[PDB]
Design a protein around this ligand. Sequence first.
Ligand SMILES: COc1ccc([C@@H]2Sc3ccccc3N(CCN(C)C)C(=O)[C@H]2OC(C)=O)cc1
Ligand SMILES: CCOC(=O)C1=C(COCCN)NC(C)=C(C(=O)OC)[C@@H]1c1ccccc1Cl
Ligand SMILES: O=P(O)(O)OC[C@H](O)CO
Ligand SMILES: O=P(O)(O)OC[C@H](O)CO
Ligand SMILES: O=P(O)(O)OC[C@H](O)CO
Ligand SMILES: O=P(O)(O)OC[C@H](O)CO
Ligand SMILES: O=P(O)(O)OC[C@H](O)CO
Ligand SMILES: [Ca+2]
Ligand SMILES: [Ca+2]
Ligand SMILES: [Ca+2]
Lengths: 232, 219, 232, 219
Amino acid sequence: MYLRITNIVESSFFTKFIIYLIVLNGITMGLETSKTFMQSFGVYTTLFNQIVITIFTIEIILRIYVHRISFFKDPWSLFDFFVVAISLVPTSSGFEILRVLRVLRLFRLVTAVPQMRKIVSALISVIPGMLSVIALMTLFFYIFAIMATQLFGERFPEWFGTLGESFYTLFQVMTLDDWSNGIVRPLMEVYPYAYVFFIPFIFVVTFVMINLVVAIIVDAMAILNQKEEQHI
Amino acid sequence: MYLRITNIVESSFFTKFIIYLIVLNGITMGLETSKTFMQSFGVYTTLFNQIVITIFTIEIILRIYVHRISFFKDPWSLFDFFVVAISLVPTSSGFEILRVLRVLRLFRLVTAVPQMRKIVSALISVIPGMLSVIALMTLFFYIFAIMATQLFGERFPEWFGTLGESFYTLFQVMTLDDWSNGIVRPLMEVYPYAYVFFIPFIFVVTFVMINLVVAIIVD
Amino acid sequence: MYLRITNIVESSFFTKFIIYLIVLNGITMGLETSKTFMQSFGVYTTLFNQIVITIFTIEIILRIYVHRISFFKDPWSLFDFFVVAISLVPTSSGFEILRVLRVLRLFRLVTAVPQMRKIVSALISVIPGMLSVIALMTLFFYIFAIMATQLFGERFPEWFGTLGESFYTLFQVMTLDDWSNGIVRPLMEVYPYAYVFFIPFIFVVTFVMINLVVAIIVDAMAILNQKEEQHI
Amino acid sequence: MYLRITNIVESSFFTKFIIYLIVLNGITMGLETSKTFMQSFGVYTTLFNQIVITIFTIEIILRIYVHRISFFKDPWSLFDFFVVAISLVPTSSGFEILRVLRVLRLFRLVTAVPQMRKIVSALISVIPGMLSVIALMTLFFYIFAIMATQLFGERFPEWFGTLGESFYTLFQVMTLDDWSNGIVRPLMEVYPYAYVFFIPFIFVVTFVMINLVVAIIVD
Ligand SMILES: COc1ccc([C@@H]2Sc3ccccc3N(CCN(C)C)C(=O)[C@H]2OC(C)=O)cc1
Ligand SMILES: CCOC(=O)C1=C(COCCN)NC(C)=C(C(=O)OC)[C@@H]1c1ccccc1Cl
Ligand SMILES: O=P(O)(O)OC[C@H](O)CO
Ligand SMILES: O=P(O)(O)OC[C@H](O)CO
Ligand SMILES: O=P(O)(O)OC[C@H](O)CO
Ligand SMILES: O=P(O)(O)OC[C@H](O)CO
Ligand SMILES: O=P(O)(O)OC[C@H](O)CO
Ligand SMILES: [Ca+2]
Ligand SMILES: [Ca+2]
Ligand SMILES: [Ca+2]
C-alpha cells in the first residue's frame, strides 16, 4: 500500500511520461487555436484534451498518497494542486475563463523539468528585499491616484475617473507609454498646470525603480555575503 | 513632577493610534472616490475627516513641546507640520486649490512607521553624489532648450514656442515618448535637418543618464 | 604546394588586401542605394560585386586547402564560409530572394579583424548562462499567446485570436511599445478585465529581464571575485 | 612684455569674474529667448552680448601667450576657443544658424569649473573603452539600413526610401519608440514578414546595449 506504490511514482520515465504528456497537450493547444486544424481533426484534440487531463489527476493523487503531509508543504505541488484542479471544474458549458485557465497546465512543464525550478526560484529569491520597496509604491499611487480623480475626473473620466481608472492611468504613465502626447498634453490643454502632477511623479517613479537595481546587488547580495562566503 | 506630558507622546502605543488613525483617514478619502458613496454615507465622512484634523493639530502641537532640540530640525515633523497646516482651510486672501493638497497627509503612514522610514532614507541615501550631474544636465536641458525655441518657435509654437514650452518637449524626447513621428518626423518637414539636434541630443541625455546608473553601484 | 599557399594566406598582405577589399565594398554598397547612381555608373559596381565575390570564393578554397580541418571547427570561420557561399548566388534572375542577404558579406570584417571578435565574444559569452531562461520565456509566452487567440481574437483579428498574431502583439507589449492606449484600452472596452492579462503579464515579463541582466552583471562580477580572494 | 600678465590670469580672481559674466550672459541668453523681452528691452542689451564677447575674445589672447604651444594642446581650452569664434558672427551673416550657435558659449560653465571639468573626463573616461563597441554597431545599423531600401522603401519611401531614411527609422526602432504600431505593423499590410527583419534586429540591438552597460565597470 506504500512500497509498490512509492517506487512507481518516483520513476525515471513516468516523469518523462507526464513530461511526455505536458509537452504533448501543449502542441494540440497550438492547433486547437487555428480552426483550420480543428475542423479537420476536431474530436481528436477535444477528447485528447480529456484523456490527458486524467493521467495528471492520478499523478497528483498518487503523489498525494506517497508524500502525504509534505505534498501540502510544496508550493510546486500545491501549485500543481492549484493548476491541475482548476481544470477539474466544468469549464465546458460555462464561463469563458476556466476554459482558458485550464491552459495553465503548461505552467506544469515549469513544475516538471528540474533546473527550471531553481532559476524560477532564483527569481522568486528576489521579492523579500523588494516587498519593502513594493509597499512604499502602493501608497505613493493610492495618494497620487486620488489627487488625480479630483482634478481631472469629470473632464477626463476614461483616464482618471473612478480611482481604479486613476490606477490604470497612473501605471501607464509610469512605464511612460504614450504619456507624453497621449495623456499629459491633452490634460495640459484644459488644465495647463497638470505637468506639476506628472513630471515629478515620473521622477519619483523611475528614480525609485532605478534605486532598486542599485540595491538588488547591494541589499540582496549582502545576505549572500554574510553567511555563505565567510564559510571560506 | 513637572512636564508629565512628554511620557505619552513617546511610546510604542501612540503610533497604532495615530498610525491607525492615519490609516483610517488614509482610507476615507478613497471611498470619497465612489460617487455614490458620498451620497448615502457622506454624512459620517465629512466629520470623520475633521475629527482627526484637530486630533492631528492636537498630536502635532502636542509633539511640538516634547521635542525641541531637534523638532523644527526634524523635516519629517515639519513635513507633518506643513501637511497638517494646509488641511485647516488657510485664510490668506486666496482661492480654492488646496482642498486637494490635504490628502498629502496620508504620506504620514510613512512619516511615523520606521519600515516606511528606513526606505525613504535609502531613497535620499545618495541623492548627493548625484545632485551635481542633475545640475549639469539641467544646464544641458537649458541650453538645448534655448536653440530649440531659437530654432523651431515660429513654425512650431505648440511644441516649442517659449522657453517653458521647449522644456516640456525635450523631457518627453528624453523619456522618448513617441519622439520620432510624434515630434521629429514633422519638424523635419519645414526643416529637413532637424535630426542632428535629436539623434545627438538623444544620446547625450541617455548616455549621461546611463553612466549615472553605473557610477553609483560601486557605492 | 602546401607550404607555399600557406605563405599567401595568413600573411600581413592578406590584411592589406581582404579587410581593404571588404571596406571598399561597404563604401560601394552605400551607393547601390539612392538609385540615381545605378542608372549612371552602376555597372562598375554590379560587377565590382563579382571581383569581391571571386576574390572571396577563392579564399573559400585557399583556407580550406591550408587549414584543411582547422577551418570547419573555428567559430569565426564557418561564418565567412556561410557569408560567402550564401552570397554566392545568381546575380539577378529568379524570384529574387537572397539578393538582399548578400550585404552580410560586410560582416566579414568582424571575422578578419581580431578587435571585433573579442567584443562579439564579450557579448555572446553571456548567452548560455541564460539559454534556459530564454526558454523559460518561450514557455511563458506560449501559454500566453494561446491565451490570446482564445481570448480577444474574436473581435481583434489584427492583434490576436491566432497563435501567430498574438506572439507578436505581446512582444510589442513587452517592450511597452504604444501598449496601453494603443492596444489595451481598446480590448478593455470590449472586455474591461483585459488588464488582468497585461497588468500582470507586464510586471512579470519586465521582472524576469531585470533579474536576467542583474544576473549578467553579477555573472561577470562573481568570476572576478574568486581569483582575487584566495590570494591578495 | 611676454611674461607679465600671467599674474592676472593664474589667479583666484580671474575665473569667477568670467563665470559671473557667463552666468549673467547665461541668464541674459535664456532671456534672449523671449517673444517680448528681446523686442521691448533686448535691443538695449543686444550690446551686452557683444561687449561680453569682446571681453571674452581678449581673454583668449593672453591665455594663448601664457601657454605658447600649450593652449591648443589642452582639451577644455580648445573648446571655448572655437566656441567663441562661432559666437563672433557678424550681426548679419549668410545663414543665421550661427546666431543660434551663440548659446554654445554658455558651455564655458563646464570647462571652467573643475567639478564640471573632470566629470566630463569621467564621462569620456568610458567612451574610449566603448569605441570598442560603438563601431561594432554603426556597422550593424548600417547594413540593416541597406537591406530596408531594397525591401521596404518603394512602398514606404518616407521611412526606408534611402539610406538616411533607414538610418532614422532604425535608430527609431532601437529607441523602441512607437515602432510596432507606428512603423512595423503598417509594413505588414504590404510585406508580411517585415517583422522577421525587425524583431531580432530588436534583439541584436537590444542585446548589445545591455551587455555594454554590464561590462562598463571594466572599460
Ligand atoms: C527581448 O526584446 C526586448 C525585451 C525587453 C526590452 C526592454 S523594454 C523595457 C521594459 C521595461 C523598462 C525598460 C525597458 N527598456 C527601455 C529603454 N528603451 C526605451 C531604450 C529597454 O530598452 C529594454 O530593456 C533594457 C534594459 O534595455 C527590450 C527588448
Ligand atoms: C474587480 C474590480 O477590480 C479591478 O479591476 C482593479 C483592481 C482590483 O484587482 C486588482 C488587480 N491588479 N485593482 C486596481 C489597482 C485596478 C486599477 O485601477 O488598475 C489596475 C482595478 C480597477 C479599478 C477600477 C476600475 C478599473 C480597474 Cl482595472
Ligand atoms: O496556422 P495558422 O496560420 O492558422 O496559425 C496558427 C496555427 O494554429 C499554427 O498551428
Ligand atoms: O518662461 P518665459 O520665457 O515665458 O518667462 C516668464 C517671465 O515671467 C516672462 O518675463
Ligand atoms: O536652417 P533653417 O534656416 O532652416 O533653421 C532651422 C534649422 O536649420 C534646423 O533645425
Ligand atoms: O470574456 P470576458 O468577458 O471574461 O473578458 C475577458 C477578460 O476581460 C480578460 O480578457
Ligand atoms: O513578403 P515578400 O516576399 O513580398 O518580401 C518582402 C519583405 O522582405 C518581407 O519582410
Ligand atoms: Ca507612442
Ligand atoms: Ca511608447
Ligand atoms: Ca519607448
